[PDB]
Tab-separated table of C-alpha atoms in Angstrom:
chain	number	residue	atom	x	y	z
A	1	UNK	CA	-8.133	37.635	9.363
A	2	UNK	CA	-10.496	39.284	11.538
A	3	UNK	CA	-9.044	39.034	15.231
A	4	UNK	CA	-11.286	36.945	17.587
A	5	UNK	CA	-13.607	38.417	20.165
A	6	UNK	CA	-11.870	37.269	23.242
A	7	UNK	CA	-14.976	37.701	25.267
A	8	UNK	CA	-16.720	34.998	23.370
A	9	UNK	CA	-17.087	31.624	24.635
A	10	UNK	CA	-14.268	29.458	22.789
A	11	UNK	CA	-15.533	26.665	20.821
A	12	UNK	CA	-14.310	23.812	18.718
A	13	UNK	CA	-16.114	21.461	16.251
A	14	UNK	CA	-14.479	17.756	16.767
A	15	UNK	CA	-14.476	16.135	13.350
A	16	UNK	CA	-15.537	12.586	12.845
A	17	UNK	CA	-13.134	9.769	13.985
A	18	UNK	CA	-11.120	12.174	16.272
A	19	UNK	CA	-11.241	12.994	20.076
A	20	UNK	CA	-10.021	15.901	22.243
A	21	UNK	CA	-8.751	16.212	25.739
A	22	UNK	CA	-9.729	19.062	27.768
A	23	UNK	CA	-8.816	19.709	31.576
A	24	UNK	CA	-10.857	22.193	33.630
A	25	UNK	CA	-8.012	23.645	35.635
A	26	UNK	CA	-10.478	25.344	38.334
A	27	UNK	CA	-12.869	22.470	39.256
A	28	UNK	CA	-10.254	20.012	38.663
A	29	UNK	CA	-11.883	17.861	36.233
A	30	UNK	CA	-10.987	15.934	32.871
A	31	UNK	CA	-13.042	14.733	30.203
A	32	UNK	CA	-12.206	13.251	26.661
A	33	UNK	CA	-14.786	14.183	23.897
A	34	UNK	CA	-15.174	11.802	21.104
A	35	UNK	CA	-16.447	11.603	17.369
A	36	UNK	CA	-18.460	14.504	15.728
A	37	UNK	CA	-19.096	17.097	18.210
A	38	UNK	CA	-18.963	20.748	19.462
A	39	UNK	CA	-16.603	21.502	22.363
A	40	UNK	CA	-16.737	24.461	24.304
A	41	UNK	CA	-14.248	25.570	26.875
A	42	UNK	CA	-14.843	26.879	30.505
A	43	UNK	CA	-13.010	30.100	31.498
A	44	UNK	CA	-10.164	27.736	32.916
A	45	UNK	CA	-10.262	24.898	30.748
A	46	UNK	CA	-7.686	24.256	28.094
A	47	UNK	CA	-7.074	21.788	24.956
A	48	UNK	CA	-4.126	19.217	24.790
A	49	UNK	CA	-2.036	20.322	21.915
A	50	UNK	CA	-0.266	17.378	20.007
A	51	UNK	CA	2.928	17.782	18.339
A	52	UNK	CA	3.047	14.828	16.246
A	53	UNK	CA	5.271	13.579	13.380
A	54	UNK	CA	4.912	13.768	9.694
A	55	UNK	CA	7.116	14.343	6.429
A	56	UNK	CA	8.938	11.829	4.334
A	57	UNK	CA	10.953	9.750	6.475
A	58	UNK	CA	8.833	10.946	9.353
A	59	UNK	CA	10.762	13.837	10.793
A	60	UNK	CA	9.376	14.503	14.161
A	61	UNK	CA	7.300	17.875	15.376
A	62	UNK	CA	6.298	18.674	11.946
A	63	UNK	CA	2.740	18.713	12.531
A	64	UNK	CA	0.361	20.222	15.290
A	65	UNK	CA	-2.885	18.513	16.149
A	66	UNK	CA	-5.858	19.702	18.707
A	67	UNK	CA	-7.560	16.384	18.132
A	68	UNK	CA	-6.463	12.764	18.059
A	69	UNK	CA	-7.286	10.726	14.776
A	70	UNK	CA	-8.474	7.343	15.768
A	71	UNK	CA	-10.214	6.013	12.724
A	72	UNK	CA	-8.725	3.538	10.106
A	73	UNK	CA	-6.154	5.170	8.322
A	74	UNK	CA	-2.500	4.894	7.053
A	75	UNK	CA	0.831	6.545	7.007
A	76	UNK	CA	3.559	5.739	5.036
A	77	UNK	CA	7.291	5.855	5.603
A	78	UNK	CA	10.596	5.394	3.778
A	79	UNK	CA	12.936	2.751	5.625
A	80	UNK	CA	16.567	2.284	4.475
A	81	UNK	CA	17.995	-1.017	5.495
A	82	UNK	CA	20.791	-3.543	4.617
A	83	UNK	CA	20.896	-7.261	3.830
A	84	UNK	CA	23.565	-9.803	4.802
A	85	UNK	CA	25.402	-9.252	1.661
A	86	UNK	CA	25.912	-5.785	2.580
A	87	UNK	CA	23.751	-4.193	-0.086
A	88	UNK	CA	21.760	-1.220	0.967
A	89	UNK	CA	18.336	-0.759	-0.374
A	90	UNK	CA	15.449	1.473	0.688
A	91	UNK	CA	11.631	0.743	1.036
A	92	UNK	CA	8.114	2.240	0.897
A	93	UNK	CA	5.962	0.922	3.524
A	94	UNK	CA	2.379	1.793	4.403
A	95	UNK	CA	0.649	0.971	7.952
A	96	UNK	CA	-2.844	0.718	8.158
A	97	UNK	CA	-3.692	1.359	11.770
A	98	UNK	CA	-6.655	2.252	13.927
A	99	UNK	CA	-6.718	3.018	17.722
A	100	UNK	CA	-8.850	0.515	19.984
A	101	UNK	CA	-11.320	2.051	22.403
A	102	UNK	CA	-13.511	-0.279	24.384
A	103	UNK	CA	-15.242	1.755	26.663
A	104	UNK	CA	-15.515	5.577	25.759
A	105	UNK	CA	-17.012	6.413	29.298
A	106	UNK	CA	-14.018	4.839	30.974
A	107	UNK	CA	-11.779	8.208	32.446
A	108	UNK	CA	-8.597	5.608	32.536
A	109	UNK	CA	-8.955	3.907	29.090
A	110	UNK	CA	-9.448	7.189	27.318
A	111	UNK	CA	-6.765	8.978	29.200
A	112	UNK	CA	-4.380	6.334	27.758
A	113	UNK	CA	-5.003	7.537	24.212
A	114	UNK	CA	-3.160	10.787	24.923
A	115	UNK	CA	-0.180	9.335	27.071
A	116	UNK	CA	2.256	8.744	24.143
A	117	UNK	CA	3.102	12.247	22.975
A	118	UNK	CA	3.718	11.036	19.270
A	119	UNK	CA	2.167	7.788	18.045
A	120	UNK	CA	3.446	8.253	14.416
A	121	UNK	CA	7.006	8.664	15.226
A	122	UNK	CA	6.686	5.890	17.805
A	123	UNK	CA	5.183	3.425	15.554
A	124	UNK	CA	7.164	4.271	12.445
A	125	UNK	CA	10.404	3.546	14.065
A	126	UNK	CA	9.078	0.517	16.335
A	127	UNK	CA	8.320	-1.263	13.226
A	128	UNK	CA	11.272	-0.195	11.109
A	129	UNK	CA	13.727	-1.539	13.870
A	130	UNK	CA	12.055	-5.117	13.276
A	131	UNK	CA	12.494	-4.747	9.391
A	132	UNK	CA	16.165	-3.724	9.936
A	133	UNK	CA	16.637	-6.650	12.182
A	134	UNK	CA	14.953	-9.454	10.326
A	135	UNK	CA	16.524	-8.263	6.824
A	136	UNK	CA	19.882	-8.027	8.170
A	137	UNK	CA	20.347	-11.757	8.576
A	138	UNK	CA	18.985	-12.602	5.285
A	139	UNK	CA	20.756	-12.690	2.074
A	140	UNK	CA	19.561	-10.164	-0.925
A	141	UNK	CA	18.628	-12.952	-3.388
A	142	UNK	CA	16.030	-14.446	-0.676
A	143	UNK	CA	14.801	-11.067	0.065
A	144	UNK	CA	14.244	-9.860	-3.431
A	145	UNK	CA	12.135	-12.855	-3.973
A	146	UNK	CA	10.234	-13.207	-0.728
A	147	UNK	CA	10.214	-9.527	0.883
A	148	UNK	CA	6.298	-9.817	1.328
A	149	UNK	CA	6.806	-12.485	3.799
A	150	UNK	CA	10.154	-11.335	5.177
A	151	UNK	CA	8.342	-8.166	6.266
A	152	UNK	CA	5.039	-9.651	7.282
A	153	UNK	CA	6.905	-12.125	9.418
A	154	UNK	CA	9.207	-9.528	10.998
A	155	UNK	CA	6.313	-7.180	12.116
A	156	UNK	CA	3.934	-9.585	13.122
A	157	UNK	CA	5.072	-12.316	15.636
A	158	UNK	CA	3.325	-15.619	16.464
A	159	UNK	CA	-0.266	-12.682	14.404
A	160	UNK	CA	-2.725	-10.758	12.512
A	161	UNK	CA	-2.234	-7.334	14.214
A	162	UNK	CA	0.647	-5.544	15.969
A	163	UNK	CA	-1.043	-4.063	19.099
A	164	UNK	CA	0.993	-1.431	21.027
A	165	UNK	CA	-0.421	-1.569	24.789
A	166	UNK	CA	0.724	1.881	25.861
A	167	UNK	CA	-2.086	3.946	24.032
A	168	UNK	CA	-3.954	1.547	22.247
A	169	UNK	CA	-2.835	1.547	18.913
A	170	UNK	CA	-2.904	-1.462	16.531
A	171	UNK	CA	-1.305	-1.550	13.094
A	172	UNK	CA	-2.970	-4.661	11.349
A	173	UNK	CA	-1.410	-4.217	7.875
A	174	UNK	CA	1.716	-3.287	6.357
A	175	UNK	CA	2.054	-2.823	2.471
A	176	UNK	CA	5.435	-2.773	0.986
A	177	UNK	CA	5.347	-0.671	-2.365
A	178	UNK	CA	8.911	0.146	-3.463
A	179	UNK	CA	12.009	-1.754	-3.047
A	180	UNK	CA	15.270	-0.547	-4.850
A	181	UNK	CA	18.945	-0.442	-4.162
A	182	UNK	CA	20.632	2.897	-3.141
A	183	UNK	CA	23.652	2.262	-5.060
A	184	UNK	CA	23.821	2.816	-8.801
A	185	UNK	CA	26.242	0.040	-9.524
A	186	UNK	CA	24.019	-2.400	-7.714
A	187	UNK	CA	21.316	-1.528	-10.100
A	188	UNK	CA	23.710	-2.079	-13.036
A	189	UNK	CA	24.601	-5.364	-11.943
A	190	UNK	CA	20.773	-6.304	-12.118
A	191	UNK	CA	20.083	-5.105	-15.671
A	192	UNK	CA	22.799	-7.714	-16.812
A	193	UNK	CA	20.749	-10.374	-14.631
A	194	UNK	CA	17.952	-9.727	-17.088
A	195	UNK	CA	19.566	-9.305	-20.368
A	196	UNK	CA	20.531	-12.975	-20.094
A	197	UNK	CA	17.157	-14.192	-18.922
A	198	UNK	CA	15.835	-13.267	-22.352
A	199	UNK	CA	18.806	-14.930	-24.283
A	200	UNK	CA	17.817	-18.236	-22.191
A	201	UNK	CA	14.317	-18.049	-23.723
A	202	UNK	CA	15.450	-16.980	-27.285
A	203	UNK	CA	18.022	-20.029	-27.367
A	204	UNK	CA	15.712	-22.419	-25.958
A	205	UNK	CA	12.966	-21.442	-28.720
A	206	UNK	CA	15.770	-21.807	-31.311
A	207	UNK	CA	16.766	-25.172	-29.925
A	208	UNK	CA	13.249	-26.734	-29.880
A	209	UNK	CA	12.732	-25.327	-33.598
A	210	UNK	CA	15.793	-26.758	-34.557
A	211	UNK	CA	14.994	-30.194	-33.080
A	212	UNK	CA	11.437	-29.876	-34.697
A	213	UNK	CA	13.256	-29.386	-38.045
A	214	UNK	CA	15.433	-32.447	-37.619
A	215	UNK	CA	12.702	-34.469	-36.961
A	216	UNK	CA	10.972	-33.536	-40.090
A	217	UNK	CA	13.839	-33.886	-42.197
A	218	UNK	CA	14.176	-37.411	-40.686
A	219	UNK	CA	10.628	-38.294	-41.386
A	220	UNK	CA	10.772	-37.056	-44.678
A	221	UNK	CA	13.724	-38.983	-45.469
A	222	UNK	CA	12.497	-42.063	-43.946
A	223	UNK	CA	9.623	-41.996	-46.474
A	224	UNK	CA	11.640	-41.391	-49.399
A	225	UNK	CA	13.744	-44.338	-48.812
A	226	UNK	CA	10.877	-46.388	-48.492
A	227	UNK	CA	9.254	-45.183	-51.650
A	228	UNK	CA	12.591	-45.917	-53.825
A	229	UNK	CA	12.656	-49.665	-52.937
A	230	UNK	CA	8.652	-49.744	-53.639
A	231	UNK	CA	9.465	-48.121	-57.154
B	1	UNK	CA	32.138	5.417	10.323
B	2	UNK	CA	35.318	4.708	7.719
B	3	UNK	CA	34.700	5.302	3.980
B	4	UNK	CA	37.022	2.538	3.225
B	5	UNK	CA	35.182	0.220	5.269
B	6	UNK	CA	32.010	0.936	3.423
B	7	UNK	CA	33.800	0.652	0.021
B	8	UNK	CA	34.979	-3.165	0.932
B	9	UNK	CA	31.122	-3.770	1.572
B	10	UNK	CA	29.835	-2.808	-1.844
B	11	UNK	CA	32.134	-5.214	-3.408
B	12	UNK	CA	30.823	-7.874	-1.288
B	13	UNK	CA	27.194	-7.071	-2.790
B	14	UNK	CA	28.649	-6.885	-6.445
B	15	UNK	CA	29.589	-10.706	-6.209
B	16	UNK	CA	26.587	-11.706	-4.559
B	17	UNK	CA	24.688	-10.672	-7.852
B	18	UNK	CA	27.069	-12.716	-9.909
B	19	UNK	CA	26.504	-15.705	-7.669
B	20	UNK	CA	22.644	-15.647	-8.551
B	21	UNK	CA	23.262	-14.883	-12.151
B	22	UNK	CA	26.078	-17.662	-12.954
B	23	UNK	CA	23.528	-19.952	-10.828
B	24	UNK	CA	20.491	-19.301	-13.363
B	25	UNK	CA	22.836	-19.746	-16.451
B	26	UNK	CA	23.962	-23.042	-15.102
B	27	UNK	CA	20.509	-24.054	-14.438
B	28	UNK	CA	19.467	-22.866	-17.863
B	29	UNK	CA	22.522	-24.771	-19.362
B	30	UNK	CA	21.662	-28.025	-17.786
B	31	UNK	CA	18.156	-27.858	-19.010
B	32	UNK	CA	19.122	-27.115	-22.514
B	33	UNK	CA	21.642	-30.221	-22.292
B	34	UNK	CA	18.687	-32.468	-21.081
B	35	UNK	CA	16.475	-31.421	-23.849
B	36	UNK	CA	19.129	-31.844	-26.507
B	37	UNK	CA	19.676	-35.327	-25.150
B	38	UNK	CA	15.985	-36.236	-25.191
B	39	UNK	CA	15.698	-35.114	-28.733
B	40	UNK	CA	18.647	-36.944	-29.957
B	41	UNK	CA	17.270	-40.024	-27.914
B	42	UNK	CA	13.930	-39.933	-29.826
B	43	UNK	CA	15.572	-39.259	-33.247
B	44	UNK	CA	17.872	-42.166	-32.915
B	45	UNK	CA	15.146	-44.642	-32.107
B	46	UNK	CA	13.049	-43.277	-35.085
B	47	UNK	CA	16.038	-43.802	-37.381
B	48	UNK	CA	15.878	-47.574	-36.677
B	49	UNK	CA	12.086	-47.649	-36.719
B	50	UNK	CA	12.264	-46.352	-40.225
C	1	UNK	CA	-19.809	34.364	-9.938
C	2	UNK	CA	-22.670	36.073	-8.106
C	3	UNK	CA	-21.750	35.649	-4.511
C	4	UNK	CA	-24.266	33.761	-2.695
C	5	UNK	CA	-27.125	34.908	-0.312
C	6	UNK	CA	-25.853	33.866	2.853
C	7	UNK	CA	-29.308	34.339	4.675
C	8	UNK	CA	-30.627	31.447	2.420
C	9	UNK	CA	-31.063	28.033	3.376
C	10	UNK	CA	-27.992	25.873	1.925
C	11	UNK	CA	-28.970	23.041	-0.205
C	12	UNK	CA	-27.340	20.557	-2.352
C	13	UNK	CA	-28.500	18.000	-4.811
C	14	UNK	CA	-26.925	14.591	-4.044
C	15	UNK	CA	-26.378	12.719	-7.481
C	16	UNK	CA	-27.333	9.328	-8.530
C	17	UNK	CA	-25.215	6.298	-6.771
C	18	UNK	CA	-23.732	8.857	-4.203
C	19	UNK	CA	-24.350	9.540	-0.393
C	20	UNK	CA	-23.386	12.354	1.814
C	21	UNK	CA	-22.599	12.542	5.293
C	22	UNK	CA	-24.123	15.447	7.323
C	23	UNK	CA	-23.894	16.073	11.357
C	24	UNK	CA	-26.157	18.609	13.225
C	25	UNK	CA	-23.789	20.092	15.694
C	26	UNK	CA	-26.750	21.737	17.991
C	27	UNK	CA	-29.186	18.757	18.340
C	28	UNK	CA	-26.087	16.275	18.428
C	29	UNK	CA	-27.631	13.962	15.484
C	30	UNK	CA	-26.090	12.388	12.361
C	31	UNK	CA	-27.502	11.233	9.353
C	32	UNK	CA	-26.515	9.696	5.831
C	33	UNK	CA	-28.407	10.663	2.880
C	34	UNK	CA	-28.577	8.298	-0.191
C	35	UNK	CA	-29.063	8.314	-3.871
C	36	UNK	CA	-30.768	11.226	-5.907
C	37	UNK	CA	-32.084	13.619	-3.113
C	38	UNK	CA	-31.984	17.281	-2.112
C	39	UNK	CA	-30.380	17.817	1.229
C	40	UNK	CA	-30.736	21.007	3.217
C	41	UNK	CA	-28.507	22.079	6.117
C	42	UNK	CA	-29.825	23.427	9.383
C	43	UNK	CA	-27.921	26.376	10.790
C	44	UNK	CA	-25.435	24.119	12.421
C	45	UNK	CA	-25.174	21.297	10.299
C	46	UNK	CA	-22.145	20.765	8.130
C	47	UNK	CA	-21.086	18.287	5.109
C	48	UNK	CA	-18.446	15.755	5.528
C	49	UNK	CA	-15.851	16.828	3.103
C	50	UNK	CA	-13.635	14.074	1.405
C	51	UNK	CA	-10.043	14.655	0.382
C	52	UNK	CA	-9.714	11.738	-2.006
C	53	UNK	CA	-6.940	10.575	-4.444
C	54	UNK	CA	-6.833	10.876	-8.218
C	55	UNK	CA	-4.070	11.215	-10.959
C	56	UNK	CA	-2.114	9.068	-12.900
C	57	UNK	CA	-0.389	7.030	-10.473
C	58	UNK	CA	-2.746	8.172	-7.771
C	59	UNK	CA	-1.210	11.013	-6.043
C	60	UNK	CA	-2.907	11.808	-2.930
C	61	UNK	CA	-5.240	14.739	-2.004
C	62	UNK	CA	-5.776	15.769	-5.672
C	63	UNK	CA	-9.426	15.797	-5.410
C	64	UNK	CA	-12.297	17.081	-3.031
C	65	UNK	CA	-15.800	15.461	-2.710
C	66	UNK	CA	-18.711	16.707	-0.938
C	67	UNK	CA	-20.187	13.119	-1.645
C	68	UNK	CA	-19.386	9.623	-1.582
C	69	UNK	CA	-19.518	7.691	-5.043
C	70	UNK	CA	-20.748	4.219	-4.246
C	71	UNK	CA	-21.936	2.896	-7.529
C	72	UNK	CA	-20.362	0.300	-9.748
C	73	UNK	CA	-17.352	2.019	-11.389
C	74	UNK	CA	-13.559	1.670	-11.772
C	75	UNK	CA	-10.389	3.601	-11.365
C	76	UNK	CA	-7.024	2.877	-13.177
C	77	UNK	CA	-3.573	2.847	-11.677
C	78	UNK	CA	0.001	2.695	-13.165
C	79	UNK	CA	1.949	0.094	-11.120
C	80	UNK	CA	5.591	-0.413	-11.369
C	81	UNK	CA	6.911	-3.941	-10.410
C	82	UNK	CA	10.089	-6.214	-10.983
C	83	UNK	CA	10.425	-9.839	-11.651
C	84	UNK	CA	12.680	-12.456	-10.251
C	85	UNK	CA	15.091	-11.771	-13.318
C	86	UNK	CA	15.362	-8.283	-12.111
C	87	UNK	CA	13.701	-7.170	-14.977
C	88	UNK	CA	11.587	-3.817	-14.315
C	89	UNK	CA	8.310	-3.345	-16.207
C	90	UNK	CA	5.309	-1.149	-15.320
C	91	UNK	CA	1.797	-1.988	-15.705
C	92	UNK	CA	-1.914	-0.372	-16.224
C	93	UNK	CA	-4.684	-1.742	-14.295
C	94	UNK	CA	-8.175	-1.074	-13.812
C	95	UNK	CA	-10.168	-1.870	-10.689
C	96	UNK	CA	-13.980	-2.523	-10.867
C	97	UNK	CA	-15.725	-1.586	-7.407
C	98	UNK	CA	-18.607	-0.887	-5.744
C	99	UNK	CA	-19.418	-0.202	-2.139
C	100	UNK	CA	-21.664	-2.833	-0.331
C	101	UNK	CA	-24.592	-1.732	1.645
C	102	UNK	CA	-27.029	-3.748	3.052
C	103	UNK	CA	-29.386	-1.694	5.255
C	104	UNK	CA	-29.196	2.087	4.457
C	105	UNK	CA	-31.323	2.945	7.717
C	106	UNK	CA	-28.681	1.415	9.761
C	107	UNK	CA	-26.816	4.266	11.665
C	108	UNK	CA	-23.706	2.124	12.126
C	109	UNK	CA	-23.325	0.423	8.779
C	110	UNK	CA	-23.836	3.712	6.811
C	111	UNK	CA	-21.101	5.303	9.351
C	112	UNK	CA	-18.503	2.940	8.375
C	113	UNK	CA	-18.738	4.224	4.769
C	114	UNK	CA	-17.294	7.287	5.654
C	115	UNK	CA	-14.677	5.789	8.055
C	116	UNK	CA	-11.715	5.338	5.522
C	117	UNK	CA	-10.540	8.890	4.681
C	118	UNK	CA	-9.314	7.795	1.061
C	119	UNK	CA	-10.744	4.564	-0.127
C	120	UNK	CA	-9.281	5.362	-3.611
C	121	UNK	CA	-5.360	5.703	-2.218
C	122	UNK	CA	-6.081	2.759	0.138
C	123	UNK	CA	-7.327	0.338	-2.364
C	124	UNK	CA	-4.873	1.227	-4.983
C	125	UNK	CA	-1.824	0.411	-2.967
C	126	UNK	CA	-3.424	-2.437	-1.002
C	127	UNK	CA	-3.670	-4.323	-4.499
C	128	UNK	CA	-0.380	-3.040	-5.725
C	129	UNK	CA	1.352	-4.402	-2.811
C	130	UNK	CA	0.123	-8.132	-3.754
C	131	UNK	CA	1.004	-7.461	-7.320
C	132	UNK	CA	4.481	-6.501	-6.412
C	133	UNK	CA	4.710	-9.184	-3.913
C	134	UNK	CA	3.564	-12.179	-6.120
C	135	UNK	CA	5.477	-11.175	-9.355
C	136	UNK	CA	8.938	-10.622	-7.529
C	137	UNK	CA	9.091	-14.471	-6.760
C	138	UNK	CA	8.214	-15.014	-10.578
C	139	UNK	CA	10.556	-15.166	-13.614
C	140	UNK	CA	10.065	-12.965	-16.508
C	141	UNK	CA	9.361	-15.640	-19.348
C	142	UNK	CA	6.289	-17.169	-17.077
C	143	UNK	CA	4.958	-13.724	-16.375
C	144	UNK	CA	4.949	-12.638	-19.863
C	145	UNK	CA	3.038	-15.417	-20.851
C	146	UNK	CA	0.638	-16.016	-18.014
C	147	UNK	CA	0.248	-12.371	-16.472
C	148	UNK	CA	-3.601	-12.501	-16.585
């Protein structure tokens, strides 16, 4: 809207659970400011601008950030894999994450937070490869029944967390949401799998009722036959 | 890369479903036969006991 | 309607069973105000604005909140799952919840209340995954009878 007063000291309000990186190009000094705080540039200081990944299947360079979100949060991704039966089926996941910072006054620990240029696009493909790998050696009937364990065993090894030692990211959860075949024929073959699971139950209740009817007819006949001789 | 190779793999998964459905039908059929036998076995004892 | 007097001290009435988070950007101080109270900004203080999830199947970013509802309440979600017989069937659930706060004068406990950006969208998918997982290994006839 109104163009800025360029002779005015530049300043930025860093949000809660966020850090910015700023390097003074004149005094040759760096600093990383945390949490909720006002950050004001010198005449030669600059912000570190983060080109990050966002989108559905996490396309790269779809978001720009002046600050690094380091609080407990999640981002969701759509992962297409294929089982050992050569049945292709896409997934919808959600990765609960947070950066782990021990000492915020360490110039070497806090510098590592900004080392990876794109932690979102890195982590969403470093996890999808393990999913793809561990599912491709598993048949479809096993995966459709036990997919909450296949994925949790693929992502976490032998573990509660999946720490990334480059920057400091952990991914302490994955929550699979949607699992469905890509092919329409494969979906048509599975409705005929459930149109028979009903018939199993209905033919079973009809058989149980028939057995009970036969037992009652026999008990009635057995009392009538005794009563005739007693008459 | 080939489309034919991809067509040959969908016919590999249209049979992996039929394996599972024919398996559940066989298991249900065996259980139905076992129940019909147990019903017959109690009815046959009850007739002699009458 | 009438545009506000910007030279007037900004003030907000925090409802019952709600908290707001406000950070003074000049004195470098934070505070979290609870329950029913009037909250007035300084010249450099700001409110924490919560983008939350609402809707039928809980779409994200469909609601904006200046305060955090922490009283006993529920929110309902529609969850589509599938049994081991490959029969797809949707559900309607209701999650009775409340935030648990021990000491309201703790600057570290009360700060954790605002750490998750979207607790509604987080909890409605952290529970639906367990539902989806435990049903997919269960046949339909068992689930229709024992789904509670």
